[PDB]
From a paper:
The binding of RBD to the receptor hACE2 is an essential step for virus to entry cell, thus we first explored if the binding of six SARS-CoV-2 variant (including Alpha, Beta, Gamma, Mink-Y453F, Mink-F486L and Mink-N501T) RBDs to hACE2 were changed in comparison with wild-type (WT) SARS-CoV-2 (the first strain of SARS-CoV-2 which was isolated from a clinical patient on Jan 6, 2020, GISAID: EPI_ISL_402119) RBD. Given that residues at positions 417, 453, 486, and 501 are involved in the interactions between the RBD and human ACE2 (hACE2), it is important to understand the detailed binding of these novel variant RBDs to hACE2. To further elucidate the molecular mechanism underlying the binding of these SARS-CoV-2 variant RBDs to hACE2, we prepared for RBD-hACE2 complexes and obtained five crystal structures, namely Alpha RBD-hACE2, Beta RBD-hACE2, Gamma RBD-hACE2, Mink-Y453F RBD-hACE2, and Mink-F486L RBD-hACE2 at a resolution of 2.9 Å, 2.6 Å, 2.8 Å, 2.4 Å, and 2.7 Å, respectively. Each complex structure was comprised of one copy of the RBD-hACE2 molecule in one asymmetric unit.
VOC Alpha (B.1.1.7 lineage or 501Y.V1) emerged in the United Kingdom (UK) in September 20206. Some very weak hydrogen bonds are possible between N501 and ACE2, but the phenyl of the Y501 side chain could make many new favorable nonbonded interactions with hACE2, i.e., a cation-π interaction with hACE2 K353 and a π-π stacking interaction with hACE2 Y41. These noncovalent interactions in Y501 variant are stronger as compared to the WT type. These results were consistent with cryo-electron microscopy structures of the N501Y SARS-CoV-2 spike protein in complex with ACE2. Corresponding with the binding affinity, more efficient transduction efficiency of pseudovirus particles of Alpha and Beta than D614G strain were observed in susceptive cells, although our assays were limited to pseudovirus viruses.
Author numbering:
A (entry chain A): 19 to 614
B (entry chain B): 333 to 527
Write the structure that this text describes.
């Protein structure tokens, strides 16, 4: 028997062993997240520890089959994915050092508090305390206090830890034969040995920068229109040609400009479409919300929700005594068990989130027949892209009228369309320079292109240059402001939110073309179109079994990430913005700062 | 008017594991095949060669009733000319099979919260099974070239694996009880007819 035949047998034992341990770990995790008790914490940690230990063992056993001698590519994918596990590459001491740094940094972020001057007992956490200030407060000084206090008392704690975190992560990445830890992260998009579909780690950097260049004209005009409206509300604080102060962007970091809508709404006399009142008028409950979401996927040819889904999911808040983690999540426990955890309220926001989360379920169900290790989205951006396009179609006035929530006597005029697209652009477009710049900074830090004594200097040089955002207070190299964001201090890659954004509009444009949609792309509803559902399902059932370049091609007919559908989505706003900024400055000077 | 003991097979408390499938020989009795087919309690009732429709009007020398438990997605393997873990390693029907296959969901009996590990199946075997062959061996499967020495390790795995049935599993992973009626015809007394 050859090395490959031994590998096929090894994966057969692994699949059936992992399938069982994963189900016990997810069940224990589910039982805590629905019934929060001390004993449920113990059960999760046990089942989770046995799952992790099983992975450490099987990862070591997988390495004894050397990849060079495997030829069945679907076998090499599973063998490779199991082999890359960084616990058994560094020394025991260095791995122990790294796990302590990661846990400390996570604890500082989640327990870090800030206490207002003259009252050392009235302190605030990031959630919900400081987040409420950055999301609702219009007072310049209160926002500046929350922005600076977070970075000066929690960020400074994280700076020495992050420096050692970079050193150890690079050692682990280099020992796995990557250039650096950023190179390791870019390996999610790597494809080898498939003619016409390969993709290198370096090619991701070029494609991100190439596509970001085409985003710049739309971002420049959105930045200009936002600056003009903010300047009307804060005349003494904002330069007509300078960057936007970092503490006036709607949240703690300016990751999304969603909460700038109140001050930047183009037509404040036209209200938003909000079917929450209609749902309550018709006595909708959570079960009706998810029944409609199930109806939506059935209309395009996707399968019913399983009987276990209705019996085993938790679609309402359990009650007073019983406590649950209410963050909406879609659970793929395996063994045919699919569930949604959601503390659903009768609102339009929860109606759309149900379509988003059930979109995750449809993806999970579609690739359930794949081997265990290939049961995932084509790359890190596919799964979230699938969920987002479901809320795109479900929120259109076309869809809301057909399901009897929006009256037939509501007609969209070009002003509510512009209101909607700007609100969309504040979240979707505003995050793209933020996402690209942050991940670019981390890539260079891992590469070594930024020395430690210039981390903060370079961090705000790029914020001014790429994002058009300026710090309101000068920050020396005792600060670590990127670490003041969850993903940076909790060791999550960030470029996924950029690639996913481009994927979702590529998906929606392709599915609307299959649905024979007539009109602007943002008004499309793929409901009742089986051709659209078939086109989506052809990719969903692939999972990770095929290169993401081929999986993308199954939906859109192109092998690479493309920014054109995103610009096609926002074209009505782009022409409006350019006409709005005819007597406004477009662009920004990087030398202006609010601290003169 | 001696009635065949089908109740001992269908209404048994516990079923055999598929690798160790059971076989009850049926002889010298009257069998009412119409009661089974027209009971509607079964999710699968497919007959090959013989027909289910009032074929209690025939006579056979001996009837063999094979019973075991598998998961729902493997019931399709209890059929002529099928491949897969069950059909190749646990329980194989012949191509010329003349008989019936009966199956029904048993999540209410064979599933337990936390997992029911009573039912096993064979995951590895050096070759496929001949029809109606049974293998209950627990010898460690040798996948490599180094001898295993009766314990599992690198390229050495104990062959039998468990289902671990849980009530919250999907239908495709839920336990199904299976009865496989074999109909035998020899130049022989033909002691099983049934009106
Ligand atoms: C297994 O047990 C069931 C229940 O006792 C049997 O079905 C019963 O059959 C009698 C007639 O003999 C009826 O009076 C009952 O109403 C039936 N009950 C149910 C629940 O079906 C069944 O026949 C038994 N299986 C076999 C093979 O004999
Ligand atoms: C969680 O709640 C269920 C009922 O909703 C109860 O039966 C169960 O015992 C609780 N779990 C724990 C671990 O206490
Ligand atoms: C890879 O192996 C699987 C099962 O061992 C087989 O079904 C498949 O055809 C193989 N693929 C190739 C390209 O040989
Ligand atoms: C879903 O609907 C189809 C008909 O379109 C039906 O055949 C199937 O049994 C249903 N599934 C469930 C779980 O209700
Ligand atoms: C989908 O088709 C059904 C069946 O006629 C219809 O009632 C519903 O309004 C349609 N919805 C859309 C969005 O086309
Ligand atoms: Zn999601």
């Amino acid at each position: 028997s050859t090395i490959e035949e031994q590998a096929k047998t090894f994966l057969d034992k692994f699949n059936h062993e992992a399938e069982d341990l994963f189900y016990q770990s997810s069940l224990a995790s589910w039982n805590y997240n629905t019934n929060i008790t001390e004993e449920n914490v113990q059960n999760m940690n046990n089942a989770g520890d046995k799952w992790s230990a099983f992975l450490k063992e099987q990862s070591t056993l997988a390495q004894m089959y050397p990849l060079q001698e495997i030829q069945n590519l679907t076998v090499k994918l599973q063998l490779q994915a199991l082999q890359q596990n960084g616990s058994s590459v560094l020394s025991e001491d260095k791995s122990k050092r790294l796990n302590t740094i990661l846990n400390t940094m996570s604890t500082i972020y989640s327990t870090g508090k800030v206490c207002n001057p003259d009252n050392p007992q009235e302190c605030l956490l990031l959630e919900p305390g400081l987040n409420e200030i950055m999301a609702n407060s219009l007072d310049y000084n209160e926002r500046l206090w929350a922005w600076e206090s977070w970075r000066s008392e929690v960020g400074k704690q994280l700076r020495p830890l992050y420096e050692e975190y970079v050193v150890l992560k690079n050692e682990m990445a280099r020992a796995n034969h990557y250039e650096d830890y950023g190179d390791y992260w870019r390996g999610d998009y790597e494809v080898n040995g498939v003619d016409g579909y390969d993709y290198s780690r370096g090619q991701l950097i070029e494609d991100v920068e190439h596509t970001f260049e085409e985003i710049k004209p739309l971002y420049e005009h959105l930045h200009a229109y936002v600056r003009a409206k903010l300047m009307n509300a804060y005349p003494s604080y904002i330069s007509p040609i300078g960057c936007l102060p970092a503490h006036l962007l709607g949240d703690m970091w300016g990751r999304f400009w969603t909460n700038l809508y109140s001050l930047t709404v183009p037509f404040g006399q036209k209200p938003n479409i909000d079917v929450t009142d209609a749902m309550v008028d018709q006595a909708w409950d959570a079960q009706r919300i998810f029944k409609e979401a199930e109806k939506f996927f059935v209309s395009v040819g996707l399968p019913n929700m399983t009987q276990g889904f209705w019996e085993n999911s938790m679609l309402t808040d359990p009650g007073n005594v019983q406590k649950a983690v209410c963050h909406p999540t879609a659970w793929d426990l395996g063994k045919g068990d699919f569930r949604i955890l959601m503390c659903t309220k009768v609102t339009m926001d929860d109606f759309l989130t149900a379509h988003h989360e059930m979109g995750h379920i449809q993806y999970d169900m579609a690739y359930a027949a794949q081997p265990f290790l290939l049961r995932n989205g084509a790359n890190e951006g596919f799964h979230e892209a699938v969920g987002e396009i479901m809320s795109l179609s479900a929120a259109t006035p076309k869809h809301l009228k057909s399901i009897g929530l929006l009256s037939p006597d509501f007609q969209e005029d070009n002003e509510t369309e512009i209101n909607f697209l700007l609100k969309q652009a504040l979240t979707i477009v505003g995050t793209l320079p933020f996402t690209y710049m942050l991940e670019k900074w981390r890539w260079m830090v891992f590469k070594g292109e930024i020395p430690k004594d210039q981390w903060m200097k370079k961090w705000w040089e790029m914020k001014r240059e790429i994002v058009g955002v300026v710090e309101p207070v000068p920050h020396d190299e005792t600060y670590c402001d990127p670490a003041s964001l969850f993903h940076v201090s909790n060791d999550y890659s960030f470029i996924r939110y950029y690639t996913r954004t481009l994927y979702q509009f590529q998906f929606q444009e392709a599915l609307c073309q299959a649905a024979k949609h007539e009109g602007p792309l943002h008004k499309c509803d793929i409901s009742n179109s089986t051709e659209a559902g078939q086109k989506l399902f052809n990719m969903l059932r692939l999972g990770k079994s095929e290169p993401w370049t081929l999986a993308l091609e199954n939906v859109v007919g192109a092998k690479n990430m493309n920014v054109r559908p995103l610009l096609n989505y926002f074209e009505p706003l782009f022409t409006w913005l350019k006409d709005q900024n005819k007597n406004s400055f477009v662009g920004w000077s990087t030398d202006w700062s609010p601290y003169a | 008017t001696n009635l065949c003991p089908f109740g001992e097979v269908f209404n048994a408390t516990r079923f055999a594991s598929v690798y160790a499938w059971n076989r009850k020989r049926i002889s010298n009795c009257v069998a009412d095949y119409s009661v089974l087919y027209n009971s509607a309690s079964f999710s699968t009732f497919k007959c090959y060669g013989v027909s289910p429709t009032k074929l209690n009007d025939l006579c056979f020398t001996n009837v063999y009733a094979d019973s075991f438990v598998i998961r729902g997605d493997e019931v399709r393997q209890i059929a002529p000319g099928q491949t897969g873990k069950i059909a190749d390693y646990n329980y194989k029907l012949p191509d010329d099979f003349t008989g019936c296959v009966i199956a029904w969901n048993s999540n209410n009996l064979d599933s337990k919260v936390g997992g029911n590990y009573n039912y096993l199946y064979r995951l590895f075997r050096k070759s496929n099974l001949k029809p109606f062959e049974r293998d209950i061996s627990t010898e460690i499967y040798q996948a490599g070239s180094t001898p295993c020495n009766g314990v599992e390790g690198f390229n050495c795995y104990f062959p039998l694996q468990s289902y671990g049935f849980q009530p919250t599993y999907g239908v495709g992973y839920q336990p199904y009880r299976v009865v496989v009626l074999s109909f035998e015809l020899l130049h022989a007394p033909a002691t099983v007819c049934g009106p």
